[PDB]
Amino acid sequence: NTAASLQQWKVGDKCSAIWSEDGCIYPATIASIDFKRETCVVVYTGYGNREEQNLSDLLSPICE
Numbered sequence: 001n002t003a004a005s006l007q008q009w010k011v012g013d014k015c016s017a018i019w020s021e022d023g024c025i026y027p028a029t030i031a032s033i034d035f036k037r038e039t040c041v042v043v044y045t046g047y048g049n050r051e052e053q054n055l056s057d058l059l060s061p062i063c064e
Ligand SMILES: CN(C)C(=N)NCCC[C@H](N)C(=O)O
Pocket: 019, 026, 044, 047, 048, 049
């Protein structure tokens, strides 16, 4: 189940995010967090793409 919904993040943290385009988990680092939108922008590592994710949706990063 999705137990990791108790996520609290800071900018510059590595994580994994769901790509809007494929819907898959990809490695991304937090570029900015807007606690009011309860969301944060992540930059997909290796790609350079950036999109906004929910703090609670963010998953633990890769082993890199
Ligand atoms: C998780 N991400 C961002 C990716 N798997 N990206 C691949 C496509 C990257 C290209 N700049 C584009 O956005 O079209």
